[PDB]
A = this chain, B = another copy of it.
Amino acid sequence: SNVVFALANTSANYRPLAEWFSQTGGKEKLEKLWNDASHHTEKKITKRSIMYWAHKHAPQQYKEIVEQGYFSILAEYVYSYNGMLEHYMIAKVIYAMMGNKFVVDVDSNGKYVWFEFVLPGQPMNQGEIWKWRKEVNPDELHIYISENFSRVMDRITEHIKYHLSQPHESNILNYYKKLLKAFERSKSKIFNDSFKKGVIRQAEFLFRQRSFIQTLDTNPHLLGVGNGVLSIETIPAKLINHFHEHPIHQYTHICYVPFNPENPWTKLLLNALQDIIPELDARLWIMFYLSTAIFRGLKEALMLLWLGGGCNGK
């Protein structure tokens, strides 16, 4: 089901559905046909789910096809227009490059704020590990335009130099020579500050989400913990420790939940918070109400008063 709501944004999704799920076994999708054309739903996961479902199960072929598509987009953009490259096509290749790492949205004052997804191999603050962080300027994107885009620029240059040393007539040789000269002139522009600022302000229209600010932490069943994302939708804790489409921003640096242990510290806490108060039939409603503080809203409307004791566990 997850793949078909992920590519339900495709207008003709039935053809990829029959292409991928009629696969050993399969047996014509076991004769379900999307469970006889199941009804769509609300804003579920997107193509970033299939984007993420590679890169750790078959990373080599996935990396090869993404590099080939990268080179294909850049080759189309340097072949339609002779040698010069400018802001929007660099922005387009950048959006193809990290469409699953950066978003941008307008929040209050008409300005565009960038949100960056973080990875373990990145300088975080304490606990933003799989959550969107707010950047006043996308510093990582500027760095990636300056350094990592130069690899694809050198790939384009190597392809041009390979096409130059081929046996055809001198007119195509002269066309490739002037194409190489103009592309070499336009190659150093990706290191320019004004060019990179233009590329960023052009990609602000490409990384746009427009459902990000107003749906940021409206989901009450999600917690930003130091290990990542804690989901309490299921009966056990989920502890999302990978890429996800849950668009939360705020976090907690100390939660770090490794499920429920039975080590010395949790046993000490269990012996400390109770067994000092004489409770009747294991009376535990007090800390039971001290739970459900991980729920955001839309709950019961009780209030607890604990004005009792001088030097207690108050």
Name A residues whose Cβ lies closer than 8 Å to a Cβ of B.
Answer: 80-82, 84, 86-89, 106, 110, 112, 123-126, 136-137, 139, 142-143, 146, 150, 154, 184, 187-189, 191-194, 196, 198-199, 201-202, 205-206, 208, 210-211, 214
Contacts and interface: CB of A to CB of B under 8 A. Distances in A.
Contact of A202 (B87, B184, B193): B193
A110 B138 CA distance: 12
A191 B123 contact: no
Copies of this chain, tallied across the complex: 2
A193 B188 contact: no
Given A123-B210, A125-B210, A211-B123, A139 B192 contact: no
Contact of A139 (B81, B123, B208): B208
A306 to B, nearest CB: 22
A143 B210 contact: no
Given A82-B184, A123-B211, A136 B192 contact: no
Contact of A194 (B136, B198, B205): B198
A208 B126 CA distance: 15
Which of A184, A199, A210 has most B Cβ within 10 Å?
Answer: A210
